[model samples]
Target: SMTNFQTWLDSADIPVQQNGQWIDLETGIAYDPSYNYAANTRRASLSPRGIDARAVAKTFGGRALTGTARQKEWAEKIRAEKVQQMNQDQAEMACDPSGLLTAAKFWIENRNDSAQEIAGFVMQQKALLAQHRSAKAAGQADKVAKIAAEYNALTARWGF
Candidate 1:
């Protein structure tokens, strides 16, 4: 049955462009150069022209991977509370001020320790979540959002 299906489509050869051009069979999304950079800016898929390839982690449901500011979100608190207070340089610290917002601020300041540490925290949480680590991660996300809101507002006031 499957074999017959493939052969039939090839025989009909649904009229297609000789070039590699294509039409989304389902959506009928036509193409146009008018959809250039600015126009396509909003398109944040995994494609090359979509969200920057380098910014993939930022897209793969990891918007928290941007800066701690972005990651210091409401969702970071639950995990932190679960950790019951980790610590500075805590390889896996969830929301220890030094974890979420501090790590985020570090991103803006140094970008060295901040990047590595943040990456570790996210990885660890992800792995934990893989094994059902949502509880703690949720706590951390929540804390980050609560504290960072005020911290961020103050930082902005300082004209950063």
Candidate 2:
């Protein structure tokens, strides 16, 4: 989109047609000839309608500078960084429950305190529910009631 800078970059040189001749509306506000040339030179790039990434990558990758160690080293490093960033994005998109648990896993992997807190609460509820089932089967009314109260309080605290 930026490569087509001319589409939006022509404001300063407002033009008008006078007697079939193009004329500047305000010469004083117009950029100098050198500035206009510089701008055009910089804006020279592909249009999305005609551009190809594979062609561009090959053109740069097969340059005469390929013999240089700096080029080879930095090229691979740049490519690896690109793949890592792409993998990060793909992993985020591949998450179940949308991004909720994806974000949770990311935070947990990074040792985030709040993410760990949620994980801890979920694990505590699971263990308590298991204990409650056995207590109910044994007819331990007091133990079952206490576990139910704790579970209810936890859910209330989380508001879910």
Candidate 3:
């Protein structure tokens, strides 16, 4: 909807008429001709509809306004919902060690801390598995047994 609002504002070629001063449709602010020709020019202008666009701009700290205060608040709410959904997806993958590798892959791409921990555990288990195979091929029963025990312990600890 922010896209629509901006597209309409840019292409419609009409500013809101309010008490002889041009009002911005999105921020409900009056326009000034003396300022630079930029989006911030109208955004920093006075609001004639009881909406403090200046205060809203200050709150955002130079971040572009997606819409009015109410619209921005709703946009944040939707963003929170999206984050919750991502968390739920991660939780489902983390519930089982079989899924941990896939989860770690996702977390790694997302730059999450869980990736390092999960990948470390997975690599340790894989190393033990490789050592067990090599010891079996070399007919080293003692090394094979030790590696098997360690592998079992890791499996139990990680629930793999």
Candidate 4:
């Protein structure tokens, strides 16, 4: 079938052979020509002007692997809170510290030992939210916003 097709086209001989198997003929996307054409345009437009072969962890479904700060944010919160509660270590633990007191106090005060332990964990995570709030205050609006969403997701996950 292919040979017959090529022979029919060869009656006119339009020189239709590709340099290599570049195009995905099933989908018609050329790897070397069309793909590189777009890539080349960007390569030439830079201030330094070269193939910028930088590694990018491109997001698939708007999900970021490096941006999951709220995943263990509770631990972060607890560490910061514990750090803040101590007097001398404030110099060593230089994170923003506002929301920890309220959240940590809530968990530590009103429960049994096991519940208090979980509460303590919750308190720690609360510290994470506090840091996010601090980041927002510090004019890191975009960074804080994503982290806040992560904090919100953390709360949602643990029924907090």
TM-score of each: 0.20, 0.32, 0.32, 0.26
Residue 91 miss distance in model 1 (angstroms): 15
Model 2 alpha-carbon drift over 4 Å, by segment: 1-113
lDDT of 3 by residue, 54-153 (tens): 3322232223224556655653333222223322222222322343333222332333333234434555676577778878998999999999999898
Residue 32 of candidate 2: its Cα lDDT? 35
Kindly state the number of residue pairs that clash in model 3: 0
TM-score of candidate 1 on Cα atoms, chains taken together: 0.20
Model 2 lDDT tens row, 1-160: 4555566557547653222222233353542322325356532222222323233222222221133465444543333222232222122222222222222223223332332244445546665777788889999999999999999998567544
Write one digit per residue (lDDT tens) for candidate 4, span 1-160: 5697778877775654432443443378654422335356522111111212121111101112121355324433333343333222121222223322233333234223332234344544656666676777889888797888877886666445
Q: Between 2 and 3, whose lDDT is larger?
A: 3
RMSD to native, candidate 3: 26.7
Question: After best superposition, candidate 1 residue 68: deviation in angstroms?
Answer: 13
The lDDT values for all models are 0.38, 0.42, 0.46, 0.40
lDDT of 4: 0.40
Q: Write the per-residue lDDT of candidate 1 for residues 1-160, one digit (tens) a residue.
A: 5687677767885743232333433367753323445556433223212333333323233234334445454323323332222222222333233234334343344333333344454444433433333334557666456455645564454335
Query: Candidate 2, after superposition: displacement of residue 142 in Å?
Result: 0.4
The per-residue C-alpha lDDT of model 2 at residue 72 equals 49
**What is the C-alpha local distance difference test score of candidate 2?**
0.42
Best by lDDT: 3
